[PDB]
Amino acid sequence: SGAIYVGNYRVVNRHLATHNDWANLVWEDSSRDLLVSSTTAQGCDTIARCDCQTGVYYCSSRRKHYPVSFSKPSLIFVEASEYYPARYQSHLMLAVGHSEPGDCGGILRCQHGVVGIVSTGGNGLVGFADVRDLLWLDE
Numbered sequence: 288s289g290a291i292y293v294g295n296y297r298v299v300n301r302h303l304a305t306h307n308d309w310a311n312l313v314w315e316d317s318s319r320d321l322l323v324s325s326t327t328a329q330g331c332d333t334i335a336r337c338d339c340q341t342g343v344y345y346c347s348s349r350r351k352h353y354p355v356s357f358s359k360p361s362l363i364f365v366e367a368s369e370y371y372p373a374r375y376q377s378h379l380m381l382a383v384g385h386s387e388p389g390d391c392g393g394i395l396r397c398q399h400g401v402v403g404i405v406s407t408g409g410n411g412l413v414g415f416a417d418v419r420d421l422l423w424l425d426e
């Protein structure tokens with residue numbers, strides 16, 4: 288679990304969005320596993336606007352942060368789950384690191400701010416949904 292709170296927006300994994308997120312929908316994209324809802328309170332977070340390929344993510348299944356080197360946002364095949372059929376997920380960044388299904392929503396940050404959120408995992412891999420291209424989150 289986890290979310291990004293920036294301005295009057297809440298960014299969550301689309302597959303973990305609540306009834307309230309859908310009732311206050313701003314934008315969603317199944318191919319990216321992202322959903323953004325509107326909030327009444329002003330949010331706590333800054334979005335990175337950079338090309339960093341290193342950063343630190345929070346891993347809930349270890350209660351720890353880990354440093355990672357990650358690939359640039361790209362189209363990656365993701366196996367079928369209870370949430371989606373087998374498909375290519377876009378704007379996904381992979382890194383070697385620990386992840387379990389409940390780790391989705393953990394934030395990845397660099398020195399410039401929030402880069403993205405955990406969205407996939409595998410045997411010693413962790414995948415992050417990028418948010419740096421969503422310029423409208425800042426206005």
Ligand SMILES: COc1ccc(CC(=O)N2CCC[C@H](C(N)=O)C2)c(OC)c1
Nearest residue numbers: 320365368370386387388406407408409
């Ligand atoms: C072994 O580590 C795992 C195993 C399985 C997963 C879960 C996973 O990847 N998905 C299930 C939820 C929707 C995801 C999507 N973006 O399509 C895909 C994991 O997530 C962090 C770590």
Ligand SMILES: [Zn+2]
Nearest residue numbers: 337339397399
């Ligand atoms: Zn950066």
